[PDB]
Design a protein around this ligand. Structure first.
Ligand SMILES: Nc1ncnc2c1ncn2[C@@H]1O[C@H](COP(=O)(O)O)[C@@H](O)[C@H]1O
Ligand SMILES: Nc1ncnc2c1ncn2[C@@H]1O[C@H](COP(=O)(O)O)[C@@H](O)[C@H]1O
Ligand SMILES: Nc1ncnc2c1ncn2[C@@H]1O[C@H](COP(=O)(O)O)[C@@H](O)[C@H]1O
Ligand SMILES: Nc1ncnc2c1ncn2[C@@H]1O[C@H](COP(=O)(O)O)[C@@H](O)[C@H]1O
Ligand SMILES: O=P(O)(O)OC[C@H]1O[C@](O)(CO)[C@@H](O)[C@@H]1O
Ligand SMILES: O=P(O)(O)OC[C@H]1O[C@](O)(CO)[C@@H](O)[C@@H]1O
Ligand SMILES: O=P(O)(O)OC[C@H]1O[C@](O)(CO)[C@@H](O)[C@@H]1O
Ligand SMILES: O=P(O)(O)OC[C@H]1O[C@](O)(CO)[C@@H](O)[C@@H]1O
Lengths: 337, 337, 337, 337
């Protein structure tokens, strides 16, 4: 039977990334990438929490505070991420939500990883301090061809590492790799991410659905039937509670932690959904799957879609397996031509 | 004005509060109270963001503490507020959501104000880093008898100051008093709330409705008809967007900034409503009216209700005047008899 | 007292200052001034500790700034103090070490106090992370004429409040006023100075002498004889320990806490002394006398000197009463004629 | 001739440690060690800067704040270092200034490095906020014998990595390895150490000597002659300035940055000096040498001494090469039997 000695342990992200990189016997290029990533997130957390806002408001006379307008969070975050990653000498191509074109890393600093990220997701709404975050996805470059936007166009099934940082009431980094999903809490007093949850698995079935019902008018009959069954359960059991923030990271994170289902279906206006494929759906789909949930467009898996455009959009539904399944069946029941 | 160009100096809460105290020719007792809530909010903020969590997870060796259950945030928060409050020498009665009874302050620290608060609102949801907050309502004692639970039972109309702090992507303090509502952004680098928005006013009409539709099966006919008109406008106008965090300060705050309507009426498991009157409804109503919005229960104004119990619940509907008005109209159409 | 056991509540600077304002039945103008110095000290503290340096070193991409010379600390500090000072509406004249002239405040912001300060003392030594500080002296304006440089030229005996903040291994504010000296420790997690030491008094006699002996070749015979007696006691008692940081606030502060004597007399390249009267000598003298120590030039008390120029220098010797007394005795033995 | 493309770069300690570890083709065990070390320093910086002091002073009623007395800085720092290092699975033996005996790392977490450290050096004096720091030295374990105190007993010449962290007005980490010395500044807003000085070299000759002259009575004739020549230069040039804090890290750091000489000679009381060999002298000697300075006991090199006790002491003189040399000659001039 199992037995044990004495072991007290504090696991920091940095420690974790090195160990895993050691187990994997990697050259350490990816380790440098995750490290640079952790450093990017920390710098975005401090900006999002508003440290320094006083300088923008004339505490030092604002003689020298190029913030005012010449320092928006959306862009600063893009800048920080772009710069910190090129500075890792581990990436060859970067796809950001903020850049129309793929960034092709200078020959001098090229590495083999492709990184698709959304610098400050849900930022449109922080005027009212809504939870925001950073979503990222990492692919290995396969072609021996000169790096190009093309290398970013790989299904989500090909992700080597994927995750997000949630700048909520506290800052969390969720990292998912082949071996699994782990959650790290940022201690902002020492600037270290402490593994607070190891090997995260999502509930089989949850009690919360998450969707923007203002679009009810434009919802396809499958969603309509699902939602109605959530509110008025035929078996006269308890209806699902409802919550929906409007920031993907916040909604998906809650879904992961408490279970349930998140949905941002296709509706005529955004006939192919609103959420972008490469740096929102894919990374979240990958995370969901590593934790044991499902992520579908309604017709097919998100991770199996092959993009033909970096800024391509895709509908998406994710959450506990028994719930996504219950909705997939409903899609099959109405599925035709 | 003699001559003043594009100028705007830095105003800290502390400076602001003191000016207003002098304008009011106060003895400085309320100022010490406001000063103490500020400090209280700053300490909770820090604890919310998880500064120092490393220690809990054994970074310096968990020598011999009684597990992980050392500092439960809602309780730490309760402690901080109560203690920095008693230390202001400005309070005689304190009513807390975490306490079954009203807390009567020792005559040595006994002052004239009665303070109602919710130290950490939305704390059950904290596991998923959702924005949480602190709500406070301040009453001037209007009696000659020993302070008691009774001094807290005054309608919200008798409030002298009310506000809240939202711990979201950034910490913000919204303070409402006789003249208007003002918003202070916390610059954590220096422990100071900077005045970023003054004499705030909610939009006349908004485009977002906030309600937990997981209760649609239990809503009254007016709420039902109302929710239905936002989704499928009878006059074929654009439908209202939907958003509901499930945490009040974040929901009420999004409502104040962008406009729209927030609702928490009674249902089949909370006939009196879920939100508490003294420390949840009244403070947000007072802020709403001061911002130029409305706060109704569907049939009467929240501030006019006469409490009979300190932990009394009450339904509430608050937001932009034109939306709250519209729902009231609907509530009249279905009138009782 | 009625009955009070082992009790001691938390006192923040803000709370303290306000209480003292009420006891003094002030109009609250000095309080706004003290409040503004506090905030000023907190912002400098943060800039000293290097919070946000990453940005300067290109973490978010040095887009197009004019090099590394963006924010020179002594200048940032100057700016902050001056601006948060003018914004208190409590100052008419400001004298700064960084400014050749006295700064006369616009009549709109014009108040009654005159503030002398050294925003960042010991800044040339900052390259090697040595403790630096801020020194302030506050004079009540005693004239009827337009405020001018002249209102600053009052002997230290006319100071209403004086103190300093030391940015060492921790930020501490030492404040001296009519009643006594009190020390506030900055808890950076919450932007609050906690009262840790009240009504402080320097030791009658100490065991450390502080002087830059790199000037032994230029010292007068009394200083020389004095330094000699501490090293080789004539009565064969234990010799005094030596310590000299080369930064005043750190040297004066070590002197206040442990006792002993600090000296900065004239030599062969500074006949008037090196330390400035208005914003270096006077504040530390006032604090020293309030703590129960002495501050002499060797021949006269520092607070009694009548300034003729705002950037006037003066030798100074301060510390425990019995040590300062001993040196004065020696200065008499070698008297002039 | 030399030419170049375009390169913007931010180097964090973590990045630097990984690259160097990659160049060195190490298994990555040492990288994990330096990483754990960086995390230890950050946690000590936050404690030293006093974050959380308010909880000790009853802000939350102190209901749960096991600080008071049951949380001293000296020990906490020891605890943090000991724990964080054992948690790296890279050390087999630890020698701390605070532990009488060598700590022998559990078989389960043994690695091959020996670490000799002083957790909070100069701590005796932080009551007056004097600069303090952390000094560390790392040896590779050579014996194939079970780890023992013995493995710590190696001359300083055998150090693989050595350095210190200075908790001054800002926090700096100085890391010296075979390839050289680099200085990293801690950005406490993001918790990252940014390389601010690359390949540090000390001035050939400095203008400052650093020594505690209170012991003049007991100084050997060599020191006596040296010092006198510093104050009264025979060539009638400028005398050396004098500075001496009383915290080794602070004095040695200043010496490194501006040049000069630091001395803590043998004097009857501490006939073999006061500074301990293994975790004060050795690490500082190693740093000095990698930067091009000298470190001698007066008779022999510090790095060549073979210790026979972990807590052994040793006299020490270090600084610019031309000055240490000028004193070594003076030792030779008086050298006899
Ligand atoms: N920190 C790490 N965690 C998990 N796998 C890693 C890690 N580092 C390297 N690997 C694996 O090793 C591969 C190559 O490592 P590398 O040579 O550094 O590019 C990566 O694509 C990973 O699949
Ligand atoms: N910001 C303020 N500070 C102090 N008093 C205020 C302030 N704003 C309004 N007042 C009024 O002043 C009254 C009494 O002053 P006090 O002696 O401090 O209790 C309060 O109850 C308020 O109605
Ligand atoms: N802490 C304090 N706050 C305000 N006034 C004070 C304080 N301590 C002493 N006083 C006295 O009050 C005087 C005038 O009050 P004021 O109207 O605010 O200018 C000052 O110049 C002081 O002599
Ligand atoms: N980060 C690093 N910087 C410099 N040298 C290193 C580093 N990592 C490993 N090495 C060298 O490689 C040796 C063995 O690496 P390791 O196998 O990890 O124990 C060490 O003793 C070093 O001399
Ligand atoms: O308010 P909507 O239309 O439901 O869109 C919100 C979605 O858009 C985003 O703000 C950006 O794509 C997401 O974070 C979020 O889930
Ligand atoms: O999940 P429910 O039933 O909608 O409760 C949510 C409401 O409860 C609260 O936590 C307070 O009781 C509010 O913050 C929030 O808006
Ligand atoms: O190096 P010196 O000549 O002793 O000057 C040091 C003195 O100068 C100051 O920086 C102020 O001029 C003080 O802080 C300090 O004690
Ligand atoms: O005051 P002294 O006797 O010169 O000793 C100070 C020395 O002792 C320590 O405090 C500890 O060994 C050192 O940091 C410092 O250089």
């Amino acid at each position: 039977t199992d037995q044990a000695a004495f072991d007290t342990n504090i696991v920091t992200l940095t420690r974790f990334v090195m160990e895993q990189g050691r187990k994997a016997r990697g050259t350490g290029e990816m380790t440098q990438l995750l490290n640079s990533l952790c450093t990017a997130v920390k710098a975005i957390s401090t900006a999002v929490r508003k440290a320094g806002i006083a300088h923008l408001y004339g505490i030092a006379g604002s003689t020298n505070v190029t913030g005012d307008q010449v320092k928006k969070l959306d862009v600063l975050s893009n800048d920080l991420v772009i710069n910190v990653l090129k500075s890792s000498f581990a990436t060859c191509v970067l796809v950001t939500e903020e850049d129309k074109n793929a960034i092709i890393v200078e020959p001098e600093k090229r590495g083999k990883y492709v990184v698709c990220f959304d610098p400050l997701d849900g930022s449109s709404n922080i005027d009212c301090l809504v939870s925001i975050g950073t979503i990222f996805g990492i692919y290995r470059k396969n072609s021996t061809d000169e790096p190009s936007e093309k290398d970013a166009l790989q299904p989500g099934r090909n992700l080597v590492a994927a995750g997000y940082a949630l700048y909520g009431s506290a800052t969390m980094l969720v990292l998912a790799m082949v071996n699994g999903v782990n959650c790290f809490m940022l201690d902002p007093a020492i600037g270290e991410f402490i593994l607070v949850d190891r090997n995260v698995k999502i509930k089989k079935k949850g009690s919360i659905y998450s969707i923007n019902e203002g679009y009810a008018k434009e919802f396809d009959p499958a969603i309509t039937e699902y939602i109605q069954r959530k509110k008025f359960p035929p078996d006269n059991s308890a209806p699902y509670g409802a919550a929906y923030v409007g920031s993907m990271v916040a909604d998906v994170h809650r879904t992961l932690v408490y279970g349930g289902i998140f949905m941002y279906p296709a509706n005529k206006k955004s006939p192919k959904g609103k959420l972008r494929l490469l740096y929102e759906c894919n990374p979240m789909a990958y995370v969901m799957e590593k934790a044991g949930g499902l992520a579908t467009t309604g017709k097919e898996a998100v991770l199996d879609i092959v993009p033909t455009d970096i800024h391509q959009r895709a509908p998406i539904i994710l959450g506990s397996p028994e719930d996504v399944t219950e909705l997939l069946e409903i899609y099959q029941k109405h599925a035709a031509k």
